[PDB]
């Protein structure tokens, strides 16, 4: 037995009074009182560290034991105080932390300390099953104390086995937690590892006397046994004599704000945007300034001005759906879904990692192939359709109740609602004036608005997730878009009849028929690889190839669409909100040149187009029509125009494309590894290694498309329908949330979900029962409200006070083109369910005792909810 085992053995023989008195005896501490008071109260600014760990690392760094720089990795991230500290050192550029989290472990915390923009914390990571990655600074703080020294030993040997792979990559600075450095085996192991990787062992005064932990740092050259046994001398010494007091030091203040970053700001053609930048600047001249610490990598920066906050992070629960869905109060999948954080911080922290990218320009051969396929496709789409300008009256008849103004300049902010503006002559005077500027070769007000999109998604770090970015221009500039390129949407250019592979206009009830069609054609498996962040992978050359419609128009229409495209789509000026220092928020004016905004009038069209192009090109690489040399320079383009002229349409009919989503049935499975052109075009797949072959489905029913799969069910009378399905937890979870706004206002928002379930997901036993329960518990004469899906394929047939079997017969029998027999179904009892196995697989709960009890007492619970909503309204019994 060594000195360490002496310390641990004497420690184990202690009692409550002994251990409590000994724990903090003579150690050093930081006043973490105001830190936890503010962290519990809320404030994300003010510079408060998220844990005591931040105090350890700093004490090391300021002593020279560690010199952080470059990319930091924080294994065993925890709350992440080590990451948030590292984000402050000047020579640090990027920080990425990983931790287990979940049940029992602390989850990463979200704070706005100086440099939070260079920190990416990921929870749910088990770093013992992680693959090592190169890094310039490696940090580890993993060691769970044990009463037994054997357990502490084997645990620390597990840790030191893990970290080795990371240390082979030769990191410049490192700081590992050694829980048990005192046993003989551990001293030998640390001796050989000290020989191989160097560094030393340091005892931090801030560690409590109840643990022998030491930190393996780079900037130490001490002897292993000398350091370990000297620390054992210190702790054993402290076990004897009177208890000595603690030395208190003020905790570290990490400031607040964001770091400046190395920029790849592509020169922004100041001739195009200078006038708009000047207009914004002069409009807010009193508080215009250049933030020296803006966090924009792949965007240009022009200035900021002080502006109030907007957006919300709150998520309210719909008590009616909750009360009527008890068995899912324990299911993690549905109880974790909530609204996203659309505040400046909540959007920004998704922006910095998902929107502030720059995709490298593809090789020239790929540029040529893209131009050929785009020209051919455009030509094919205009075979029996003609471009045309859309009109003020079409636009007026298209502006609905929920259409946002978007006023940016003083002129544009004169109306409350959109319909109030369109019926005003001064609005169209703004339109005319700006279009005159367009016809003079200028642009003075087509400026984008960016913010976060309130969505119902699963949370991250046990809190509400961040918000996906959405941007759109004000009403007048949107009108100019509609004028120019609106014909794409109005005349259904991308419809299945014209685009061949498109599915524009169709609803959620029809796509499954399309997929069943696609399966009948001979070929390989079906591939529905989604692209990761489409709107950020639309390159300058994709915009080029999409502008090739202007060579299909008359001269005036061409010049109009080439004022929109060039002055807006090819040069984007965006206004965003960002949290500044001291808790205030600010407006940033930025500008880039190579992405597709979410709210461009023709976004679904152009996206579906470019996606068709991409899938065609991939079909070419798969059928060996292209070769690995073709990326650099294309040899014999005629090898392409012949492939397109020969089999192009016969390939488009093998696709179902809806924007970024798509399904492709190729001629064989070579499509699985046709990755060179796909990757070179920036359309990197989702949820895979870049060069791993693609995986597909031999069962057309299991294929994902537009967030659903589709199943063919047979009615009682022999007929058949093809219905959309998804995992039930997303449906109930999405149903249990409310976007901020009486009980009536909620109960209606519940009836909408219940009727949508009665219309689309009637084949999910639980959702049908719960639909009858909600509708039985909600007053009959109450009109539904709210939104139940963001899908462009969710048409809203359920948002009515009309009987539901009527609309079911209408959309599944009467107006069903794939249903030839029109004999309507007379009772809900004749409409089938999914198979019990297929129902279970997608998240059914049938056969489980809890939900059988729920279904038995469902009527009594309905009467309960009738008590809660109101007892003098009229109700109906749909459960029968
Ligand atoms: N197997 C594992 N894989 C990843 N993380 C783990 C893990 N086992 C434990 N952890 C987590 O690693 C964390 C280390 S605590 C260190 C936290 C950080 N240094 C700070 O300043 O707050 C613990 O919270 C623990 O929950
Ligand atoms: Zn303009
Ligand atoms: Zn299913």
Residue numbers in the entry: 6 to 746, 749 to 887
Question: What did the article's authors report about this structure?
Answer:
To illuminate the structure and mechanism of NS5 proteins, and, more importantly, to explore potential druggable sites for ZIKV, we determined the crystal structure of full-length ZIKV NS5 in complex with S-adenosyl-L-homocysteine (SAH), by-product of cofactor S-adenosyl-L-methionine at 3.3 Å resolution. We were able to trace nearly the entire sequence of ZIKV NS5, except for the first five N-terminal residues, residues 747–748 in the RdRp domain, and sixteen residues at the C terminus. The structure reveals an N-terminal classic S-adenosyl-L-methionine-dependent MTase domain situated on top of a C-terminal RdRp domain. Near to the catalytic site, the SAH molecule is surrounded by a set of conserved residues. As with other viral RdRps20, the ZIKV NS5 RdRp adopts a capped right-hand structure with the Palm, Fingers and Thumb subdomains and a priming sequence poised to receive RNA substrates. The RdRp domain also harbours two zinc ions, as observed for the NS5 proteins of JEV and DENV3.The associations of the MTase domain with the RdRp domain does not involve extensive interdomain contacts, leading to a modest buried surface area of ∼1,400 Å2. Remarkably, ZIKV NS5 superimposes well with JEV NS5, with an RMSD of 0.63 Å over 872 Cα atoms. In particular, the MTase–RdRp associations of ZIKV NS5 and JEV NS5 are both mediated by the same set of van de Waals contacts, involving the C-terminal extension of the MTase domain (P113, L115, Q117 and W121), and the Index, Ring and Middle fingers of the RdRp domain (Y350, R354, F466 and P584 in ZIKV NS5). By contrast, structural superposition of ZIKV NS5 and DENV3 NS5 gives a RMSD of 6.06 Å over 844 Cα atoms, attributed in large part to the difference in the relative orientation between the MTase and RdRp domains. Detailed analysis of this inhibitor-binding site revealed that the critical residues for the inhibitor binding are also conserved in ZIKV NS5, arranged in a similar structural environment; therefore, suggesting that the same compound may also be inhibitory to the enzymatic activity of ZIKV NS5.
